[PDB]
Amino acid sequence: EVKPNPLQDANLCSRVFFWWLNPLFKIGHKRRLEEDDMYSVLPEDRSQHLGEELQGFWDKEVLRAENDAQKPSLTRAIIKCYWKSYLVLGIFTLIEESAKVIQPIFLGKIINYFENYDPMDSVALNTAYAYATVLTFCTLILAILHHLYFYHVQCAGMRLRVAMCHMIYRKALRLSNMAMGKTTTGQIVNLLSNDVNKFDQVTVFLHFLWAGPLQAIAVTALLWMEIGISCLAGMAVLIILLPLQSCFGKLFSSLRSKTATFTDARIRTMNEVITGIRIIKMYAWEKSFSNLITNLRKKEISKILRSSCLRGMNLASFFSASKIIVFVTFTTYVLLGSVITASRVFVAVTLYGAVRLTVTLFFPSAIERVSEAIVSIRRIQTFLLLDEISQRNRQLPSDGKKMVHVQDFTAFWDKASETPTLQGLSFTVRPGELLAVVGPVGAGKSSLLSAVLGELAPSHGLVSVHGRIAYVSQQPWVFSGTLRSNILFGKKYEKERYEKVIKACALKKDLQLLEDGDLTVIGDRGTTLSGGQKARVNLARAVYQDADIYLLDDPLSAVDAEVSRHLFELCICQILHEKITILVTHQLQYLKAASQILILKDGKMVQKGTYTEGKVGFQAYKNYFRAGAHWIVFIFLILLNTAAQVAYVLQDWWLSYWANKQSMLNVTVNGGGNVTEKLDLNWYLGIYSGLTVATVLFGIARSLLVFYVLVNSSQTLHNKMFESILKAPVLFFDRNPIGRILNRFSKDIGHLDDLLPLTFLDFIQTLLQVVGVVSVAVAVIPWIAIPLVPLGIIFIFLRRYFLETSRDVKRLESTTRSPVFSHLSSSLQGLWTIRAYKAEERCQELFDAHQDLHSEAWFLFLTTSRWFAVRLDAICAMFVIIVAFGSLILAKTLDAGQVGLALSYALTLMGMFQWCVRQSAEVENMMISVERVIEYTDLEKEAPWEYQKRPPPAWPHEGVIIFDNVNFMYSPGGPLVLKHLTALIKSQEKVGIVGRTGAGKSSLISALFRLSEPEGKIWIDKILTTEIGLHDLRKKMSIIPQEPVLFTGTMRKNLDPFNEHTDEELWNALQEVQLKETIEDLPGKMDTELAESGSNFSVGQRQLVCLARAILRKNQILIIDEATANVDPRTDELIQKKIREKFAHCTVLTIAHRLNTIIDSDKIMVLDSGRLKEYDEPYVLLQNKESLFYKMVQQLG
Ligand SMILES: C[C@@H]1CC[C@@]2(OC1)O[C@H]1C[C@H]3[C@@H]4CC=C5C[C@@H](OCCC(CO)CO)CC[C@]5(C)[C@H]4CC[C@]3(C)[C@H]1[C@@H]2C
Ligand SMILES: C[C@@H]1CC[C@@]2(OC1)O[C@H]1C[C@H]3[C@@H]4CC=C5C[C@@H](OCCC(CO)CO)CC[C@]5(C)[C@H]4CC[C@]3(C)[C@H]1[C@@H]2C
Ligand SMILES: C[C@@H]1CC[C@@]2(OC1)O[C@H]1C[C@H]3[C@@H]4CC=C5C[C@@H](OCCC(CO)CO)CC[C@]5(C)[C@H]4CC[C@]3(C)[C@H]1[C@@H]2C
Ligand SMILES: C[C@@H]1CC[C@@]2(OC1)O[C@H]1C[C@H]3[C@@H]4CC=C5C[C@@H](OCCC(CO)CO)CC[C@]5(C)[C@H]4CC[C@]3(C)[C@H]1[C@@H]2C
Ligand SMILES: C[C@@H]1CC[C@@]2(OC1)O[C@H]1C[C@H]3[C@@H]4CC=C5C[C@@H](OCCC(CO)CO)CC[C@]5(C)[C@H]4CC[C@]3(C)[C@H]1[C@@H]2C
Ligand SMILES: C[C@@H]1CC[C@@]2(OC1)O[C@H]1C[C@H]3[C@@H]4CC=C5C[C@@H](OCCC(CO)CO)CC[C@]5(C)[C@H]4CC[C@]3(C)[C@H]1[C@@H]2C
Ligand SMILES: C[C@@H]1CC[C@@]2(OC1)O[C@H]1C[C@H]3[C@@H]4CC=C5C[C@@H](OCCC(CO)CO)CC[C@]5(C)[C@H]4CC[C@]3(C)[C@H]1[C@@H]2C
Ligand SMILES: C[C@@H]1CC[C@@]2(OC1)O[C@H]1C[C@H]3[C@@H]4CC=C5C[C@@H](OCCC(CO)CO)CC[C@]5(C)[C@H]4CC[C@]3(C)[C@H]1[C@@H]2C
Ligand SMILES: C[C@@H]1CC[C@@]2(OC1)O[C@H]1C[C@H]3[C@@H]4CC=C5C[C@@H](OCCC(CO)CO)CC[C@]5(C)[C@H]4CC[C@]3(C)[C@H]1[C@@H]2C
Ligand SMILES: C[C@@H]1CC[C@@]2(OC1)O[C@H]1C[C@H]3[C@@H]4CC=C5C[C@@H](OCCC(CO)CO)CC[C@]5(C)[C@H]4CC[C@]3(C)[C@H]1[C@@H]2C
Ligand SMILES: C[C@@H]1CC[C@@]2(OC1)O[C@H]1C[C@H]3[C@@H]4CC=C5C[C@@H](OCCC(CO)CO)CC[C@]5(C)[C@H]4CC[C@]3(C)[C@H]1[C@@H]2C
Ligand SMILES: C[C@@H]1CC[C@@]2(OC1)O[C@H]1C[C@H]3[C@@H]4CC=C5C[C@@H](OCCC(CO)CO)CC[C@]5(C)[C@H]4CC[C@]3(C)[C@H]1[C@@H]2C
């Protein structure tokens, strides 16, 4: 196979340290990874194996439920399948919990040694060394073993996901027709896409369901044994932290919902602006959409700011939660009359930190993921119990005959429907005869196709279909694979028959067309073909695959007569000599190749007659931030962050200093306790309370400020983007697909509004916490700086060596995930022919291969992530060992408080470091959206809407426009389309100027509607067109598009978005233009909210309302962008009467392919190669004596 998984031959040490992954990274560092550089899935992880095992378990569960007469449970089957393999990992989770719980005990033993320091006690030093050895043993167990266990847990989750997908596909291939109608293909694709990924997550935290509450209990016990009932107080706060935060989360969700609605609305308008941007710029309607989007964005940014404030409050609350817990518990401790010591204080601090992280991060996450997985299992289960075809029976004996007969069959697509689709049909088919049903679609040719017991199971009829069915559908379908596979469809390669189809079936054209040849791989979803090829290849599969019964829904209609005649002589008469030839047709040639004709209506068979009857630079970050706020604000922000972290560390430093001062104090004030230098509770307690209050306040302020500045940056960037895009040239929209721009406006902006601020704030917070831990350790033991310089350096290199590969693997997993869904989708389009060919196992194997490839991707992703995690935690464990033992080596220059503080922070460095590195990677990956946003933010814009000119009103005094040696450039650096066009429009005249091409007539538009870029001297109103701004130029030009599109919003906004017409004006304007009978009946009257792009208005009414807007607009000219021809005839007679008296107020120029629309026009601009050779009236031109007019009259018609 491919390079076999080294995990098979990997020994225990290599598997724990992921040593076997080393070669891959090497190649991952040498070049770019592909699918060939991949590792095959393990034999026990193959999709077929897991699918079969879960099939057995689920079938057993179904049988048990049926025996005991209750609804079967999928959760029961999943548990009964994976519980043995999961409880062992729960064993390891017990071990991990025990190590995490008992590490602070040995921390307290070392600190107690420091508390009772005696330089002459060697035995105490040896005991402390042994305690440090046990502590580092525990942290290595925690470091390299939680990661091996985590990889196994994630592998279990991936196994569950793969088995579930195999289950779903196996069910889908056996789904029913009416069930297919009940459930859409989108629902099933969604099941494979987002509803099954939850199983990849729940398994991560499932064991915590019993690990969290238990560990918590244990911690409480230990805490009691240290400080008694006071510990409970701290625990109480932790408990309070569980509901309240969850409660706020609920509120969070609510706010999110509201924002969603606004976003959708905005996005809708976004689509409506980008798809019809040409029209928006054509009509000079930019102000209306601009203000509408401004209002929508303002509301959205208000709701997003509220949600961001809530999330920032949550982050600040968790950041300061440890201090609140410690402050409460130790204030209770001191106020009860006790005296604090470094050992007990820092044991309590470490235990509280561990238990708080567990209880407040893993347990609620475990509950949330379990609930999501439960609802997903419920949905997937109700799909697996979705009614399947009432059991599709293996076909009845194909005993050499072709005896089929239908006698008063009343069974349809939906049995409950009383309206007959097919019945009356009562005939008998004999072996070898050729039949061919021909006639109108009717209501049952599909039933004759499905007469293979597809969807017409006989309620009263009885059809003995014998033989092998070759079904061809209305829409031919081509599956994912190689052209050999689609032609072959499981059949063995037969060269001569393949040649036979290439000659008789005339596929040599396709051989020529394919870019690779006879080895050409069918593209994804089989696109490397055309409709003729898919229909022909369906018939080709049937005839090559030498089936017996051939059901063809008009495949010879699509193909040409040559191939059709070839298959009658060669195939239908000779090769398909003893095959069923059900062929619907409408030409006269397959009508005359047939022997029997079937014509159908609702049910009753009328007759049976015969014939004669990579990274983002500092510029990106700088522009994002300076887009956020003034650099003074950023100086204030970094000062606030530093103050917050300083207060966070100093709250514990105050406890440590109390301990250090307390150590000197124990020496004189405790042992020599007669003087009773009682600690001034007011003084000491006040500084402690002030420090913790300052920590809380500074954390809250920093979180709020970061969120506010980032959200403000997002809002300014979005506003700038809309303003910039609104001024984008039509060239940008022509070059860039609509989907690309819509995606840039939707996904990146959603990122910048939701994910980027939160991730950036979390990364900054965690990085500051890590820096605080490192600085505490360095401050306590300065020599710790010496080994820290190499370690960090190594980390940097390591990071690169991972990322350079990691991104690639991630990219690979993205490109390997969409094929699976497409194959499922492919199965859904052609399920009929899949069941027709009895090819369920082949499609199952193809889906299994697609899933196995994606399983390779997912396995690589999990394993590489664990490799990096193992090395990072090894670095952190090395740091903890270094701190604890360098503390032990000297000890002379250190006291209990400093050692306790430093060790507790080293004991917390691990999780924080993991969070910070992964979050930094996430931020760096997500900043590509910011890069794209800045790219759109600075695209080239056109001339300003108003320049300086500003003509006096009543401007279109003359309406005279001329062109004077213009050399047209359609696109900069493109072809030449107009060279010295010299038209003449008189003053104060109901006369117009029109060109023809989307760029020649747009040249006219550049002169007035402003959409192309003519070079030549242009005289509008005896003033050059150039000096007039965009809108001040766009204002006096009325126009009708090829497709008079309609925009979502009120009816009032569509008729007049600028509100320049008084109400009785719209009333009498629509009655004069006769739309009033249509609009009076509209429920919204004038302010009717239109449907999706004006669905209710007819196309005749859409052109009518655009001409009507122009009429209220009261311009003197109007351009019909080749629209006098694509006019509905009531409108044609109408528009003739219009330019006689109704558009009398607007000038129409009729350029068209409908000659009747142009004979009436006063002037015709004849153009060859896009050039005006002759310019005079049509009447001289229309007769025979004329050059080009006579050519269009002759040849063009
Ligand atoms: C995960 C597990 C949790 C429980 C547990 O294991 C790991 O935690 C360990 C702590 C250990 C003690 C630590 C300190 C010393 C001092 C040392 O001093 C020798 C002095 C001599 C020089 O050799 C003369 O100077 C003798 C041994 C002793 C008492 C350990 C005994 C075993 C203990 C109890 C272990 C216990 C089974
Ligand atoms: C509700 C939450 C879940 C359960 C739990 O947390 C809170 O509820 C707490 C009750 C605590 C015990 C109450 C009283 C004492 C007596 C004391 O002094 C006398 C000693 C002498 C008595 O016979 C000889 O042992 C020693 C400690 C002990 C046993 C407590 C231990 C911790 C315990 C089990 C805590 C436990 C983890
Ligand atoms: C959900 C709940 C939130 C918080 C809470 O429980 C859980 O946290 C507990 C802490 C308790 C105090 C701890 C110790 C004592 C002992 C005794 O005073 C010493 C007497 C004598 C002994 O030798 C001289 O030392 C009297 C009672 C007192 C003050 C407790 C009162 C109730 C308190 C405040 C509890 C409070 C309701
Ligand atoms: C965990 C949650 C956060 C809020 C809270 O619990 C829930 O946190 C607890 C702190 C408790 C106080 C701690 C200490 C004392 C001193 C004692 O005085 C006799 C001392 C004696 C020897 O020192 C003679 O001097 C009387 C009781 C009192 C005031 C407690 C009252 C209840 C308080 C306020 C609790 C409060 C409701
Ligand atoms: C602290 C004590 C020790 C531990 C423990 O007890 C208390 O903590 C509890 C957490 C409980 C689960 C939390 C959430 C759910 C989801 C729900 O599914 C959605 C259904 C809904 C969707 O809309 C309605 O349809 C099903 C129940 C389940 C899995 C709980 C199971 C029992 C559990 C494991 C309990 C466990 C024994
Ligand atoms: C990012 C920033 C880099 C620099 C910096 O912050 C973070 O690093 C901090 C460390 C601080 C010192 C720590 C300990 C002491 C000892 C004591 O000196 C004798 C006192 C004696 C005679 O007065 C008493 O009897 C007090 C002062 C001193 C030197 C601190 C000074 C400020 C310093 C330099 C801070 C400085 C602004
Ligand atoms: C981004 C953040 C900006 C600020 C910050 O981090 C990064 O900068 C660090 C400065 C550190 C203190 C410097 C000096 C000491 C003295 C030491 O004792 C000396 C005794 C001596 C006798 O020989 C040596 O042995 C005890 C600790 C303490 C107070 C430090 C605590 C942590 C502090 C506050 C850190 C603080 C959080
Ligand atoms: C921008 C940042 C704002 C905060 C901050 O930096 C800059 O401001 C600094 C002030 C520092 C303290 C100055 C003096 C002392 C006294 C010393 O006690 C000697 C006892 C005895 C020995 O002989 C005397 O004779 C212990 C250390 C301590 C408390 C410093 C702690 C760290 C502090 C709080 C620093 C803190 C990180
Ligand atoms: C940002 C935060 C604000 C500032 C702050 O944290 C950071 O900085 C810390 C430094 C601490 C002081 C260090 C050393 C001394 C020793 C001794 O000095 C007696 C001198 C007096 C009598 O002889 C002369 O008249 C008494 C205690 C004192 C002043 C500490 C008190 C608490 C202080 C001010 C802490 C305070 C909360
Ligand atoms: C940052 C925010 C501002 C408010 C605040 O946090 C949040 O700031 C904290 C500082 C605390 C005070 C510090 C020092 C003392 C002196 C002591 O006695 C002195 C006697 C003698 C010297 O020995 C005088 O010369 C009495 C208590 C008192 C006033 C504290 C009270 C509580 C206070 C006000 C805290 C308060 C909650
Ligand atoms: C972070 C939170 C906000 C700020 C704050 O709380 C915590 O940080 C503390 C800094 C403290 C002062 C620093 C240095 C000393 C000198 C020393 O000795 C000289 C005084 C002498 C007479 O001149 C007699 O001691 C002790 C007193 C004093 C002035 C502190 C007072 C309390 C203050 C103002 C606290 C303040 C409210
Ligand atoms: C984000 C950054 C992480 C790293 C870092 O900043 C923040 O963390 C700070 C901790 C600082 C030390 C704290 C305490 C002291 C004691 C003092 O005692 C002199 C007494 C006498 C004998 O020399 C004077 O004559 C000497 C200096 C020293 C060791 C600091 C050095 C600078 C350090 C390492 C800082 C370092 C750049």
Ligand SMILES: C[C@@H]1CC[C@@]2(OC1)O[C@H]1C[C@H]3[C@@H]4CC=C5C[C@@H](OCCC(CO)CO)CC[C@]5(C)[C@H]4CC[C@]3(C)[C@H]1[C@@H]2C
């Ligand atoms: C790149 C890294 C930056 C940090 C660091 O490494 C390199 O820079 C080093 C400088 C060292 C100090 C130098 C001088 C002295 C004087 C001495 O007083 C007795 C003097 C007597 C006997 O030496 C003369 O003969 C006490 C110790 C002290 C303060 C050192 C402490 C450790 C320090 C801070 C080291 C620290 C780990």
Ligand SMILES: C[C@@H]1CC[C@@]2(OC1)O[C@H]1C[C@H]3[C@@H]4CC=C5C[C@@H](OCCC(CO)CO)CC[C@]5(C)[C@H]4CC[C@]3(C)[C@H]1[C@@H]2C
């Ligand atoms: C804690 C763990 C320690 C080991 C380890 O993980 C962490 O550290 C990682 C760093 C990786 C190396 C980075 C760069 C090079 C480049 C090139 O050699 C240049 C040679 C030239 C440079 O100066 C002269 O020597 C070839 C590859 C090599 C050596 C990488 C190999 C794999 C290494 C050793 C990884 C290894 C698994």
Ligand SMILES: CN(Cc1cnc2nc(N)nc(N)c2n1)c1ccc(C(=O)N[C@@H](CCC(=O)O)C(=O)O)cc1
């Ligand atoms: C300490 N910390 C910081 C942090 C940041 N934001 C938070 N936000 C909230 N709401 N709650 C928290 N507890 C929290 N914690 C952590 C710790 C662990 C993980 C964690 O769940 N998992 C692994 C990786 C697993 C994963 O989440 O994908 C890690 O990187 O530490 C996340 C954040």
Ligand SMILES: Nc1ncnc2c1ncn2[C@@H]1O[C@H](COP(=O)(O)OP(=O)(O)NP(=O)(O)O)[C@@H](O)[C@H]1O
């Ligand atoms: N999915 C379906 N659900 C219900 N009824 C259906 C379905 N598909 C087809 N029908 C029935 O069949 C009718 C369509 O005519 P059909 O028998 O498919 O003609 P045809 O095969 O399209 N003929 P031609 O186009 O000339 O090859 C429908 O109007 C229904 O009566």
Ligand SMILES: CCCCCCCCCCCCCCCC(=O)O
């Ligand atoms: C304490 C953890 C810090 C993590 C922050 C990331 C620091 C990365 C510094 C190097 C950036 C990348 C250098 C070029 C290589 C690349 O293309 O990624």
Ligand SMILES: [Mg+2]
């Ligand atoms: Mg049909």
